[PDB]
């Protein structure tokens, strides 16, 4: 039951600044990694004439 009050003190001290990029720094990594994989597909499609639907499972 005390651990609640020590963590309340701790995240209050965090709230003094409260940037908390921990999770989204990661979330941004995951999301932008998805984008970096996705960007070649659209460039490839028109130049290499590769239907998106046929390779959609592969993509």
């Amino acid at each position: 039951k005390g651990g609640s009050k020590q963590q309340s003190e701790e995240d209050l001290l965090l709230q003094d600044f409260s940037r908390n990029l921990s999770a989204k720094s990661s979330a941004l990594f995951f999301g932008n990694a998805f984008i970096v994989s996705a960007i070649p597909i659209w460039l490839y499609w028109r130049i290499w004439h590769m239907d998106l639907i046929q390779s959609a499972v592969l993509y």
Partner: peptide
């Protein structure tokens, strides 16, 4: 996924 990634940028990396 791109918009969710930008949501990552713009909530708490600043």
């Amino acid at each position: 996924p791109l918009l969710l990634w930008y949501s990552s940028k713009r909530k708490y990396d600043t």
